Design a protein around this ligand. Structure first.
Ligand SMILES: [Cl-]
Ligand SMILES: [Cl-]
Ligand code: NA
Ligand code: NA
Length: 232
């Protein structure tokens, strides 16, 4: 089975550097781009950059160009991201993943806790949290600052992250259910406006949902919507 394995936690000091690892298995490491993603409560997910492990070629989001360095070690099938000059602003969970929807695969993420006691497309989700009773409908909006469409296809996906589990693809290209996702989920929209629907909601559906566009670089994500069950 294909896996990306990341250590759970790194507790680190301001000003230090930390090297995060992503040990891959179950597929040819050299042949698939790997991406790294930062998660925070307020900013949702941020695309850091990506590496093609076969040759080591990298691309970085301008905002992380000095903070992150991506490398790949083909002899151990492991990708690494160094974060340098740590500050409190680096405390976050960092995932490695294959982000193209057809190869969707996520590691469980490494929590990096920096501890000292002392024209990109913007995606806006609405609401950012909601509680819905069992059996009822959850509806969540994602709006982009510019169109994410090309040739009649929307380059926008939705991701779900259930509590304690890695993120996973839920809907790709606006309206397609990923394999294995239940029929109670549905997605609509085009251009700049998209909507996720879940009905009837079940307990398993409690999760954080994120939209993402990959029409233009850098790939960007919404800030996340946390759905809970409203106990009745
Ligand atoms: Cl809102
Ligand atoms: Cl269902
Ligand atoms: Na391998
Ligand atoms: Na596939």
């Amino acid at each position: 089975q294909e896996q990306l394995q990341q250590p759970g936690t790194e507790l680190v000091k301001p000003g230090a550097s930390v090297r995060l690892s992503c040990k891959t298995s179950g597929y040819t490491f050299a042949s698939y781009t790997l991406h790294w993603v930062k998660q925070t409560p307020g900013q949702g997910l941020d695309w850091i950059g990506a590496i093609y492990p076969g040759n080591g070629d990298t691309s970085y989001n301008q905002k992380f160009k000095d903070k992150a360095t991506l490398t790949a070690d083909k002899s151990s099938s492991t990708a690494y991201m160094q974060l340098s000059n740590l500050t409190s602003e680096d405390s976050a969970v960092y995932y490695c993943a294959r982000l193209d929807w057809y190869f969707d695969l996520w590691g469980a993420g490494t929590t990096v806790t920096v501890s000292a006691a002392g024209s990109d497309i913007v995606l806006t989700q609405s609401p950012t949290s909601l509680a819905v009773s069992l059996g009822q409908r959850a509806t969540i909006s994602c709006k982009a600052s510019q169109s994410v469409d090309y040739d009649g296809d929307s380059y926008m996906n939705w991701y779900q992250q259930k509590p304690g589990q890695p993120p996973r693809l839920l809907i790709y290209a606006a309206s397609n259910l990923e394999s294995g996702i239940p029929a109670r989920f549905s997605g609509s929209g085009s251009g700049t406006d998209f909507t996720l629907n879940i009905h009837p909601v079940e307990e398993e559906d409690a999760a954080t949902y994120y939209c993402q566009q990959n029409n233009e670089d850098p790939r960007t994500f919404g800030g996340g919507t946390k759905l809970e069950i409203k106990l009745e």
